[PDB]
């Protein structure tokens, strides 16, 4: 479970999300952002476990999106955390 997930930098289309590093190690972080109540399969990407911040580009301006964050150790998916932001 990534702790204390929040957006810290905002543009109409790009968002900088910063979560605190868990005490336990992270091999990789998995991020899935998708339109709130949107039937379109959510976009997904990955970052290395060293980073505590990530940036998403190309989000439509004027939509509430639902973003889900996962921590990943070797063969392990810690429980996720989610936030919803209106751009």
């Amino acid at each position: 479970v990534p702790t204390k997930l929040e957006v810290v930098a905002a543009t109409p289309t790009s968002l900088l999300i910063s979560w605190d590093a868990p005490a336990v190690t992270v091999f990789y972080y998995y991020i899935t952002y998708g339109e709130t109540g949107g039937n379109s399969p959510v976009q997904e990407f990955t970052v290395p476990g060293s980073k505590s911040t990530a940036t998403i580009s190309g989000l439509k301006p004027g939509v509430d999106y639902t973003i889900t964050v996962y921590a990943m150790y070797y063969g392990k998916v810690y429980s996720p955390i989610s936030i919803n932001y209106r751009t």
Partner: protein, 302 residues
């Protein structure tokens, strides 16, 4: 990837030695975990020089083997990231709790994995990846049938190949599998990493499902830890006899580890030589030892 030349590995040793200059700061106060990081790179240099000694008659023929190219490229990349990690970390290398220190220990685990892979593929400096013995036949049949004499493959080919026998539901899951089955973290599945995986999650018939219950939805699963980190984890539930976890050891790849608490308050461990992991887990559930995974009252069913 790129063809192998001897000058580039000169460069590479300079990098390993430079990382040795960085890590030998006592202010880090590195613990020999292992992965020690410090001891692995001398053994990497040494074993590599052993391969070179073995391939003195035919250096070019060694440079045109896929495994040595991929392995060396990856070692140069990882060691460059090991230098740039101190570069980014600056002073925050002096405390272990800091994030760049955690990244350093991560790359230590990686380095241990790569050395283990190299020693497995190159015993006595000789290439035997084409004649590599996969332990579970079912796995060996799959590998000989899907790829054959291949030693290393790109991860995409392995996802498309393994998907036909055991389907992969989504990229969310496929990433999680590419985590374990690629210990080198280089988008390349080898016969070494594959054999370790299959030995870890027998039987083959339900391999992927064995992966799911024993890894993804399990609380006691702790991936790679050292005996120091294990006791540090279970100290919080020592008063609670039967609280257990099960992990992996870098020292031993393809072997399981189980740790549990006794009524005495001592933390004793057990290793499953006979029986698979799930079966041994069930039996310990029947005996009265494996009750709380990670000190959690709910125990998953197998």
């Amino acid at each position: 990837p790129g063809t192998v030349d001897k000058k580039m590995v000169e460069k590479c040793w300079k990098l390993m030695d430079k990382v040795v200059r960085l890590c030998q700061n006592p202010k880090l106060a590195l613990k020999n975990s292992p992965p020690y990081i410090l001891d692995l790179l001398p053994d990497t240099y040494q074993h590599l020089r052993t391969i070179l000694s073995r391939y003195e008659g035919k250096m070019e023929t060694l440079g045109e083997n896929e495994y040595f190219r991929v392995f060396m490229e990856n070692l140069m990349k990882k060691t460059k990231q090991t230098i740039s990690l101190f570069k980014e970390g600056k002073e925050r290398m002096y405390e272990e709790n800091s994030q760049p220190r955690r990244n350093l220990t991560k790359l230590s685990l990686i380095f241990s994995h790569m050395l283990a892979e190299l020693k497995g593929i190159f015993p006595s400096g000789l290439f035997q990846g084409d004649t590599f013995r996969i332990t579970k036949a079912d796995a060996a049949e799959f590998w000989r049938k899907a790829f054959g004499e291949k030693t290393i493959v790109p991860w995409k080919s392995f996802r498309q190949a393994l998907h036909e026998v055991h389907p992969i539901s989504s990229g969310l899951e496929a990433m999680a599998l590419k985590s374990t089955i690629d210990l080198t973290c280089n988008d390349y599945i080898s016969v070494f990493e594959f054999d370790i995986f299959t030995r870890l999650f027998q039987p083959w018939s339900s391999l992927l499902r064995n992966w799911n219950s024993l890894a993804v939805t399990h609380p006691g699963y702790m991936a790679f830890l050292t005996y120091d980190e294990v006791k540090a984890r279970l100290q919080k539930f020592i008063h609670k006899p039967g609280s257990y976890i099960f992990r992996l050891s870098c020292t031993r790849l393809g072997q399981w580890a189980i740790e549990y608490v006794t009524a005495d308050g001592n933390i004793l461990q057990t290793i499953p030589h006979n029986k698979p992991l799930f079966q041994a887990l069930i039996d310990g559930f029947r005996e009265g030892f494996y009750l709380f995974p990670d000190g959690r009252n709910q125990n998953p069913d197998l």
